[PDB]
Structure formats: structure tokens, C-alpha cells
Design a protein around this motif. Structure first.
Motif, PDB file in Angstrom:
ATOM      1  N   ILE A 137      60.445  43.076 124.011  1.00 39.76           N
ATOM      2  CA  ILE A 137      59.224  42.910 124.730  1.00 39.76           C
ATOM      3  C   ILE A 137      58.073  42.749 123.803  1.00 39.76           C
ATOM      4  O   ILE A 137      57.184  42.140 124.105  1.00 39.76           O
ATOM      5  CB  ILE A 137      59.045  43.427 126.029  1.00 39.76           C
ATOM      6  CG1 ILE A 137      59.156  45.124 125.876  1.00 39.76           C
ATOM      7  CG2 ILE A 137      60.528  43.329 126.761  1.00 39.76           C
ATOM      8  CD1 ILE A 137      58.463  45.820 127.077  1.00 39.76           C
ATOM      9  N   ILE A 138      57.676  44.012 123.041  1.00 35.12           N
ATOM     10  CA  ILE A 138      56.537  44.200 122.300  1.00 35.12           C
ATOM     11  C   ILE A 138      56.583  43.115 121.010  1.00 35.12           C
ATOM     12  O   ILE A 138      55.386  42.973 120.786  1.00 35.12           O
ATOM     13  CB  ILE A 138      56.595  45.705 121.775  1.00 35.12           C
ATOM     14  CG1 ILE A 138      56.698  46.751 122.985  1.00 35.12           C
ATOM     15  CG2 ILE A 138      55.434  45.972 120.946  1.00 35.12           C
ATOM     16  CD1 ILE A 138      55.518  46.565 124.038  1.00 35.12           C
ATOM     17  N   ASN A 155      55.339  40.218 123.554  1.00 31.55           N
ATOM     18  CA  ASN A 155      54.458  40.618 124.599  1.00 31.55           C
ATOM     19  C   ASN A 155      54.007  42.085 124.396  1.00 31.55           C
ATOM     20  O   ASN A 155      54.769  43.079 125.187  1.00 31.55           O
ATOM     21  CB  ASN A 155      54.663  40.340 125.928  1.00 31.55           C
ATOM     22  CG  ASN A 155      54.588  38.962 126.489  1.00 31.55           C
ATOM     23  OD1 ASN A 155      55.672  38.113 126.178  1.00 31.55           O
ATOM     24  ND2 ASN A 155      53.487  38.438 126.930  1.00 31.55           N
ATOM     25  N   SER A 201      51.714  43.816 125.315  1.00 27.20           N
ATOM     26  CA  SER A 201      50.847  43.919 126.616  1.00 27.20           C
ATOM     27  C   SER A 201      51.729  44.970 127.263  1.00 27.20           C
ATOM     28  O   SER A 201      51.187  45.705 128.252  1.00 27.20           O
ATOM     29  CB  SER A 201      50.344  43.098 127.200  1.00 27.20           C
ATOM     30  OG  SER A 201      49.600  43.173 128.220  1.00 27.20           O
ATOM     31  N   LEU A 202      53.093  44.832 127.377  1.00 29.54           N
ATOM     32  CA  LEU A 202      54.154  45.394 128.095  1.00 29.54           C
ATOM     33  C   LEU A 202      54.233  47.029 127.449  1.00 29.54           C
ATOM     34  O   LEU A 202      55.286  47.694 127.995  1.00 29.54           O
ATOM     35  CB  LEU A 202      55.325  44.822 128.056  1.00 29.54           C
ATOM     36  CG  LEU A 202      55.334  43.194 128.601  1.00 29.54           C
ATOM     37  CD1 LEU A 202      56.382  42.460 128.233  1.00 29.54           C
ATOM     38  CD2 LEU A 202      55.167  43.268 130.342  1.00 29.54           C
ATOM     39  N   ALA A 260      53.668  49.567 130.064  1.00 29.53           N
ATOM     40  CA  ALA A 260      54.679  49.476 130.986  1.00 29.53           C
ATOM     41  C   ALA A 260      55.956  50.211 130.721  1.00 29.53           C
ATOM     42  O   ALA A 260      56.900  50.960 131.528  1.00 29.53           O
ATOM     43  CB  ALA A 260      55.052  47.938 131.138  1.00 29.53           C
ATOM     44  N   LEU A 261      56.291  50.027 129.393  1.00 28.71           N
ATOM     45  CA  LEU A 261      57.607  50.704 128.801  1.00 28.71           C
ATOM     46  C   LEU A 261      57.398  52.322 128.535  1.00 28.71           C
ATOM     47  O   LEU A 261      58.325  53.232 128.979  1.00 28.71           O
ATOM     48  CB  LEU A 261      58.264  50.041 127.556  1.00 28.71           C
ATOM     49  CG  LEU A 261      57.074  50.079 126.436  1.00 28.71           C
ATOM     50  CD1 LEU A 261      57.432  51.194 125.561  1.00 28.71           C
ATOM     51  CD2 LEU A 261      57.393  48.863 125.714  1.00 28.71           C
ATOM     52  N   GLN A 301      58.145  53.990 131.627  1.00 23.57           N
ATOM     53  CA  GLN A 301      59.765  53.647 131.541  1.00 23.57           C
ATOM     54  C   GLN A 301      60.368  54.486 131.018  1.00 23.57           C
ATOM     55  O   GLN A 301      61.566  55.096 131.248  1.00 23.57           O
ATOM     56  CB  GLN A 301      59.988  52.152 131.285  1.00 23.57           C
ATOM     57  CG  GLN A 301      61.417  51.895 131.551  1.00 23.57           C
ATOM     58  CD  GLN A 301      61.760  50.521 131.392  1.00 23.57           C
ATOM     59  OE1 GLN A 301      62.573  49.794 132.149  1.00 23.57           O
ATOM     60  NE2 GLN A 301      61.073  49.616 130.765  1.00 23.57           N
ATOM     61  N   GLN A 325      60.398  37.808 125.686  1.00 23.61           N
ATOM     62  CA  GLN A 325      60.832  38.235 127.091  1.00 23.61           C
ATOM     63  C   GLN A 325      60.155  37.364 127.961  1.00 23.61           C
ATOM     64  O   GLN A 325      59.203  36.531 127.518  1.00 23.61           O
ATOM     65  CB  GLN A 325      60.428  39.705 127.110  1.00 23.61           C
ATOM     66  CG  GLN A 325      58.886  40.016 127.042  1.00 23.61           C
ATOM     67  CD  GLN A 325      58.432  39.544 128.605  1.00 23.61           C
ATOM     68  OE1 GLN A 325      58.463  39.684 129.742  1.00 23.61           O
ATOM     69  NE2 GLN A 325      56.861  39.127 128.518  1.00 23.61           N
ATOM     70  N   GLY A 338      59.447  44.332 130.753  1.00 22.45           N
ATOM     71  CA  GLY A 338      58.357  45.341 130.749  1.00 22.45           C
ATOM     72  C   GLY A 338      58.854  46.808 131.191  1.00 22.45           C
ATOM     73  O   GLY A 338      60.161  47.090 131.044  1.00 22.45           O
TER      74      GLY A 338
END
Length: 72
Positions: free
Chosen positions: A21-22, A25, A27-28, A31-32, A35, A68, A72
Motif C-alpha cells: 500500500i505504501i 499510497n 498516506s496509508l 493507518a498501518l 494496525q 492498493q 490501509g
């Protein structure tokens, strides 16, 4: 895997998703970050302490894809 703390993640397929995802994006990233704590609180401790080392892990080319559409 290596020597650096988060460098062991280079082999961890679960983390491979985090980096995917990185690639597209980043920006996630935050978010991770949280996580990581829900799947590995112990690892998250290393993440916050050695984020710089973890960030570069996220940004390395991963055999997954690097794109992705709802992660995220």
C-alpha cells in the motif's frame, strides 16, 4: 533476514502487504502504524522506536505489487 530490527519484516509476508500500500499510497502509513499494534504490539514498539528503519522497509520494492484500491 538481516540485522536491523524491522529488517526481519523483509521476509514477513504479512508485512509485505503493509509495504504494498505504501508503494502507491504512502498516506496509508499512519493507518498501518496502528494496525501493526493490533497484529503485533511487540513489533509496534520497535516501529515507534526505530521508525526510520521501518519506513525504509515500507518503501523497498515488494514482490506483491505495490498498489492498493482499498487497503490501509
Amino acid at each position: 533476514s538481516g540485522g536491523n530490527p524491522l529488517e526481519f519484516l523483509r521476509n514477513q509476508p504479512q508485512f509485505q502487504q503493509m509495504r504494498q500500500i505504501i508503494q502507491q499510497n504512502p498516506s496509508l502509513l499512519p493507518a498501518l502504524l496502528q494496525q501493526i499494534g493490533r497484529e503485533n504490539p511487540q513489533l509496534l514498539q520497535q516501529i515507534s522506536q526505530h521508525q526510520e528503519q521501518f519506513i525504509q522497509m515500507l518503501n523497498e520494492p515488494v514482490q506483491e505489487a505495490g498498489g492498493q484500491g482499498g487497503g490501509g
